[PDB]
Motif scaffolding. Sequence first.
Motif, PDB file in Angstrom:
ATOM      1  N   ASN A  68      24.439   2.259 -11.651  1.00 49.01           N
ATOM      2  CA  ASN A  68      24.480   3.398 -10.807  1.00 49.01           C
ATOM      3  C   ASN A  68      24.824   4.505 -11.841  1.00 49.01           C
ATOM      4  OD1 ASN A  68      27.101   3.237 -12.066  1.00 49.01           O
ATOM      5  ND2 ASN A  68      28.204   2.709 -10.184  1.00 49.01           N
ATOM      6  N   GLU A  69      25.392   5.704 -11.676  1.00 46.79           N
ATOM      7  CA  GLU A  69      25.420   6.627 -12.377  1.00 46.79           C
ATOM      8  C   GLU A  69      26.254   6.370 -13.913  1.00 46.79           C
ATOM      9  OE1 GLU A  69      23.275   8.557 -11.483  1.00 46.79           O
ATOM     10  OE2 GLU A  69      23.523  10.038 -12.905  1.00 46.79           O
ATOM     11  N   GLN A  94      26.409   1.298  -4.317  1.00 42.53           N
ATOM     12  CA  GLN A  94      25.991   2.133  -3.334  1.00 42.53           C
ATOM     13  C   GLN A  94      26.822   2.179  -2.006  1.00 42.53           C
ATOM     14  OE1 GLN A  94      24.316   5.110  -3.973  1.00 42.53           O
ATOM     15  NE2 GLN A  94      24.354   4.105  -5.895  1.00 42.53           N
ATOM     16  N   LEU A  97      29.884   3.963  -2.844  1.00 45.63           N
ATOM     17  CA  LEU A  97      29.730   5.307  -2.937  1.00 45.63           C
ATOM     18  C   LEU A  97      29.642   5.798  -1.399  1.00 45.63           C
ATOM     19  CD1 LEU A  97      29.381   7.824  -4.334  1.00 45.63           C
ATOM     20  CD2 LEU A  97      27.010   7.240  -4.728  1.00 45.63           C
ATOM     21  N   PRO A 103      32.356   7.096  -7.182  1.00 52.93           N
ATOM     22  CA  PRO A 103      31.676   5.849  -7.784  1.00 52.93           C
ATOM     23  C   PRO A 103      32.664   4.695  -7.897  1.00 52.93           C
ATOM     24  CG  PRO A 103      32.262   7.387  -9.514  1.00 52.93           C
ATOM     25  CD  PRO A 103      32.429   8.147  -8.114  1.00 52.93           C
TER      26      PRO A 103
HETATM   27 CL   LIG Z   1      28.153   5.793  -7.889  1.00 47.43          CL
END
Ligand SMILES: [Cl-]
Lengths: 248, 233, 204, 237, 239, 234, 230, 196
Positions: A68-69, A94, A97, A103
């Motif tokens: 993820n980010e 996800q 999220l 996150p």
């Molecule tokens: Cl995220």
Amino acid sequence: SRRYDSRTTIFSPEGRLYQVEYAMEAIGHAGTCLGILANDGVLLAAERRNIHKLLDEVFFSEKIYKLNEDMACSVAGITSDANVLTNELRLIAQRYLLQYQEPIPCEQLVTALCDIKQAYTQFGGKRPFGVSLLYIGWDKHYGFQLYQSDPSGNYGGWKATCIGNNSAAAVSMLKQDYKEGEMTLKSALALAIKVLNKTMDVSKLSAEKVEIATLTRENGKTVIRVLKQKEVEQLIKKHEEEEAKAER
Amino acid sequence: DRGVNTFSPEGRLFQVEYAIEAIKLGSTAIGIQTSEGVCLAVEKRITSPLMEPSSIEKIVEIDAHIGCAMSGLIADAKTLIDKARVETQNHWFTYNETMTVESVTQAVSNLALQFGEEDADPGAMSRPFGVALLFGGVDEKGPQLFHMDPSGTFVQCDARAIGSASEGAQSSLQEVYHKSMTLKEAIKSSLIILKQVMEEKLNATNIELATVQPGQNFHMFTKEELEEVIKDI
Amino acid sequence: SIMSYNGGAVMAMKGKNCVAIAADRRFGIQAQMVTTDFQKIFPMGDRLYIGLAGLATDVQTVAQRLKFRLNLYELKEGRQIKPYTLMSMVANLLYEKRFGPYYTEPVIAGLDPKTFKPFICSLDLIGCPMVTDDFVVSGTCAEQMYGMCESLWEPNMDPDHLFETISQAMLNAVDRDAVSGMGVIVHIIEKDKITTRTLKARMD
Amino acid sequence: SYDRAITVFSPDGHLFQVEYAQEAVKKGSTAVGVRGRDIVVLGVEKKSVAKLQDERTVRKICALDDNVCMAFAGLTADARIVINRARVECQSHRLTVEDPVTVEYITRYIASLKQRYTQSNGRRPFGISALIVGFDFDGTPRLYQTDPSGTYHAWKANAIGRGAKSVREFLEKNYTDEAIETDDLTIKLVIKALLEVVQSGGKNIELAVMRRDQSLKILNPEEIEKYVAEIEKEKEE
Amino acid sequence: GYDLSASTFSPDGRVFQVEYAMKAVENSSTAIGIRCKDGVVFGVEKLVLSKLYEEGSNKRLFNVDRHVGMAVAGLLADARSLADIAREEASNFRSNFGYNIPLKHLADRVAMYVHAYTLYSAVRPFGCSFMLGSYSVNDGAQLYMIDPSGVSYGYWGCAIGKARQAAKTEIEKLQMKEMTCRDIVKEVAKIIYIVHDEVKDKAFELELSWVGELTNGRHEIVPKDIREEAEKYAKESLK
Amino acid sequence: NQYDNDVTVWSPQGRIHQIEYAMEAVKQGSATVGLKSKTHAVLVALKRAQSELAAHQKKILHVDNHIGISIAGLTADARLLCNFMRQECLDSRFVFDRPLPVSRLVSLIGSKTQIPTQRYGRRPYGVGLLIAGYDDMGPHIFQTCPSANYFDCRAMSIGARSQSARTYLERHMSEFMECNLNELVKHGLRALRETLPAEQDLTTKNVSIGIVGKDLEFTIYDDDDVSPFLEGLE
Amino acid sequence: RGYSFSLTTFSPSGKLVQIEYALAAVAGGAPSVGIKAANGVVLATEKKQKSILYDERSVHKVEPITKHIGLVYSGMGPDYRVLVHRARKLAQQYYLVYQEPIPTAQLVQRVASVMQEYTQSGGVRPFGVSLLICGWNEGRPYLFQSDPSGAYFAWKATAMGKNYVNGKTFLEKRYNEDLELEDAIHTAILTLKESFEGQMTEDNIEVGICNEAGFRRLTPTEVKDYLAAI
Amino acid sequence: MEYLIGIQGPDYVLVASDRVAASNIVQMKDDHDKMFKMSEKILLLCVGEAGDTVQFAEYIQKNVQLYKMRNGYELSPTAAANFTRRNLADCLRSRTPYHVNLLLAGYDEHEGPALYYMDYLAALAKAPFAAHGYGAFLTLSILDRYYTPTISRERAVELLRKCLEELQKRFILNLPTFSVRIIDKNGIHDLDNISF
Ligand SMILES: [Cl-]
Ligand SMILES: [Cl-]
Ligand SMILES: [Cl-]
Ligand SMILES: [Cl-]
Ligand SMILES: [Cl-]
Ligand SMILES: [Cl-]
Ligand SMILES: [Cl-]
Ligand SMILES: [Cl-]
Ligand SMILES: [Cl-]
Ligand SMILES: [Cl-]
Ligand SMILES: [Cl-]
Ligand SMILES: [Cl-]
Ligand SMILES: [Cl-]
Ligand SMILES: [Cl-]
Ligand SMILES: [Cl-]
Ligand SMILES: [Mg+2]
Ligand SMILES: [Mg+2]
Ligand SMILES: [Mg+2]
């Protein structure tokens, strides 16, 4: 059919889980993979096994996966198994999220996956996943973090560790060089190359043979980068210069 | 290794026979049926003074008119006991009457052979229950004691022992039992027998005793009521 | 009418090497304004935005569910999603609910992440896509929006002229609609930057 | 779906999977509980040390709810499943009864979960024992133990995991009205019990306390080694 | 070992579990069918294992539709289950297509059901062979025989069970194409008496059924008086 | 051997050992006898008592007004089968408003008990029954086995030492059809008594009796109610 | 019902032996070769084609997945037909959602995931094949291999099946990055000639190519033409 | 019929709610509480259809408390708001929709105070102040008229009182008493009820 069932989810007489152990032997033979936490970031460095000359080079890494980010991971063990698990990690991240609109905190992502692994040791009659993972990340609760999980469904947090080939040796070198509370990304990178230099004892260390990813914070945003070969060569060069100094 | 529903050449289910052997690893329990009520008495079997005795519960109330003593693998008894409780309450709900001791015992006994690995729901019972049960109570047939084992066989008994020392205890029961025996006599008799069979010295914390009488609901004996009965014994 | 319960308006517009997308800011429930900074335009990429008008709850659900899918898409693929591919992703999401749809009708605006070519489109609530070379509109004042865009829009507009046109189209359109307005937000999307403005606007 | 019968009887009434689960528990780190007068305490060994480990991430003492916590010995992945199941159940109970669970209630729930995994197709038993502590609504303190079979009892004090037999023996001689007269001596009784078995004493006892109404406090290495010295210098006299 | 599951071939390409099931049919006492000019007749050597049993107990001759009889050998509980399958198939056929199921189609359908139990570890092959007989003006006389592997063929004459071969050799002596059912019942009784081993198994009932022009295409038990005469003929012919 | 643990495994002799083992459960149960006349069907059973202070296991069970059963083998299997029978009977009275003919009920039992003999991981039923009934075709005695085979009987005995009871029944069976009720039950008792050790006798504690016929719904006689039938074995 | 337990498990040394034995079925299959030229990809394979009696045109080893993606394999033919069918289906599911042809790497990932399943899921064995997958997208050629474990790799050139070790060293000493597709076809066929036995005709090898215009099999007449030089 | 209000200042959120439970023509309870504590620094205020309101709020409350127990720290007011929203929205088109309107008030260590508005459709809006119920129609314009972002908590309670006095004067329903709570850095504080 009872005759053919190898009974993968049962105890042995010592309270052991043989498949799990056996999966851990698979991991020990796979590419060495280390993680190192610093004050200003975290890194993963991994031995590449995709090294034959005729290979084509098409993805940005072999064994480093963005989750993820704010998070990435590396893996040691059965590659196809690692693909199923890393796909599942992205889905969990996800789902969280979607539900919370923030996150997933790192430890929660790890725990969610480890519960899936755990299940595969307790019911369903299937072989476990032959994968150990290192996870790097940043979240707002504990900042920079590094986790390790294995086929038993166990995980922990580490400041530095190693999985895959020559793990024990790699951890000894880290025990001795790692400065709790005092490492930087630049010094962790030096230490990672030192460690891989020793534990790839078959044979002479090259940028084609390793993969390094760093995870840092810049302007309130997580930046995850796979170092280019120019930089990896430069760190190898600096490590080789540094060993020249070693006596006088 | 063979399947759980495999018959032996003698016509017995291996799993049931082995479950019956697990009953012998339990503490001794005794039931006696008199015209004045039934008593149930059980050896606790304390393994450390640090253990709380009152947390050993091997006699439980099913309903106000029915108690149950268990021996064998105690953890297995929980779903049986819960089933007996649910059943008696269903019967009350539907019929506005108390369920007979015989009927409760029957209902629980119908779970016994319901195990197996390719007829049933995704994770149904894999094995029989390692437990024997004495149901003691009073209904319109009068006072009543029934025994049940892991085969799902159940029967009325004037007096019965189960668990480790049941041979032994059963012989002393044939010796002392008589149809016209009082409940107080029955209580004393079963404490005398426990005292013989128990490895430890009998006392008011390492046993339990309960009664049910035509007059009176299920009653667990208190420390003090046990001490009183223990004096003569 | 379900689509007018919250009111609202979005549009997008193409210029030379740039696109613009705009929305009113009101969140209201029938006659009652509840808030005046409600978000309706969501980033789907550095140079790719989706605008949703319709029932506010579905505006939020669709944006969130779309983001879920896009993030998985981008992690799995090598890369940033293309505008046309986002469209198809949204179409597919809306059409899965063909028999109990989300009540929203999005517009998309962006630049191809490799070629920087402008793209705009809209979709109906069941996922029928429509690409155009000029503008698209969606919301409780669509007729008003059409009248403004058909009269003012011209081809090949530079960023400054695109900004003035989309702004004047939005302001004057929502000023003829009771349940849209309470402010206007405009994003101009160029190769090298995003410019985000709120407009002086009527607040009644 | 996988329906193999995994826990079955053997001749003589053994359930081998359950016995093997119990062997897993015996190779786990030692855990100890003592029920005080108005405190309850849990202590647990080790497990391995390792300077490069983040201590926070491997605790073996866990809150189940505000008024109930638990320690375990055995397979740590299995424990995490049990812990989470119990945490869900504590919230159902509060939901449908509007009281916190009694310690006995949640113990009985854990125990019956464990029992069901010894008698359900397709599953092996959980390889953990748990010591569960807290207070009931009326202020009574409680200490319960569960094992892989699903059996459970209340205890004045107890140990599980490797060296439980000698730790239990120690507690049997040392648990008295005097040893639990105060909070500090209760805490010290737990530390003394561990320091008997614990390798590089100690260093690596994790310790936590629960006071009537006061919710779970874990002690830190600085607060533990205060008690360690305070007992070591008393054992010279 | 290679003979524990119907889902395991041996190295020679056999399915022993089907062969073993066939051995259960070959241990059974003998049943025969004969097709003739105007119908099909069945006879069974029905061993009486206790004098305490009623006449007619453990029938081995069944009506599976009004026009279709079934004769069995092998494990009787499996045969009865197969008689139910055949019944259900004839019933379903009538519901779906609106007319009486043709014999051959019924035989092929129940054979595929038998066949399905020869592929899997999950189930075992049926321990029975059976004959199906019918007659109609349109289709004439038909006699099919199905075995535990699911093979199905049509016959002029057929025998199953332990004196199968001895029975066939007697059946071959008949010019059955030119005989009537009334003539053939006597010959069926005769043949069962020939192959019956009176030393080794002491007591038996003859069971007889037929379907033909004379029953108007209905499968029916041979009437008592005709059976007794056929027995008497068979017995005196043994002499 | 490799052939005796699964009901789905044929042996090389064409046998299924699991089914034969299940039959052993019936041979080790306590004996029961069933017989009939022109007008009545009777069951007689020896009840085994665990200890001297136990009641004595029920052997005879009510199924419907016109049907009762005597059991030998696994009691839990006996109840499951009995519950199936009961339900089949209730169903037929619900649907058709008349009693389920006894021979059809027995067919349903054969079909139901055959099924687990052919599926992996299932087992036969470990019980044998004697079935007494009365319907339009008169009285009946049927026998059912774990093999799912069943038999229509003039009379029968199953369980431990039943051979003796069977001999007795063959010896006297030509008398049964013409017997009055008392005579018929006497015969059932004499057959049953052959199964006992020489020392031991029929008593009100160990004998259970079931009767059904033209003018009599299925009725069970236990304890003091068997005494009329036991007096005048003279 | 279906067996619900895995037929592949870990050995005491950490090996999944069924997968290794699947690889041995692949190693015993007929040779296949793939070469990524600068402007396209060639896939080539030998037919284990006995008999003149075979209608060589009746079944193909070199198969289209989409207009832009094709496959060949070594190992068990019927296993391969399963994966061809699933790959086609996967490509179409992608196209329905995204309205763009599936990128080669995305198609390989999804196929490789299916092969992984058959190493863990209940009551089944792994596939006894390795796939070579060629494609063109993002203005560029791609060559991938996917093996019985579900692992996949991107190659410049490789060989699989009988005598693959030698095939790979033959290609190692013969491939250059700047090579054209017409030359690549030539060297692909020479690579099969290394381990042939039989005399090559256009009827007992198959060749597929992938470039900007799409994926297609070469025709017998086109193969015949390349075989003149060889 | 039920009134909820919230006012967010620089470093707190003040909330209030009526204390009536009505049925047909009667007040059945005059000390009703419509606030649910989710965590130390989060209140959920919930009105709407009978049954749905408690069933929904308690389900959220238990899950937020579960989250605390599993993870050792609490969900932020914004996370909890979006969790609440996801649930309501996911139920909207199901067989079990919940007919509830909400406010969510909280204080985060890093973000500061927050107030969220949600309707039964599950539209979520963050706001400096907000209200639900028919009473909102008479009080939102009082808030628009006098609220400022830096409003002190003493003046917020005054502002709140103006709203509540306006209901006494102008609203047809008898709502004589209100619960008042505030949230800040130190958690949830009960203020005196405002009563008439
Ligand atoms: Cl995220
Ligand atoms: Cl993300
Ligand atoms: Cl016992
Ligand atoms: Cl979605
Ligand atoms: Cl469960
Ligand atoms: Cl222990
Ligand atoms: Cl035959
Ligand atoms: Cl019996
Ligand atoms: Cl039994
Ligand atoms: Cl039989
Ligand atoms: Cl018998
Ligand atoms: Cl299975
Ligand atoms: Cl296809
Ligand atoms: Cl395509
Ligand atoms: Cl083609
Ligand atoms: Mg307007
Ligand atoms: Mg206005
Ligand atoms: Mg509703």
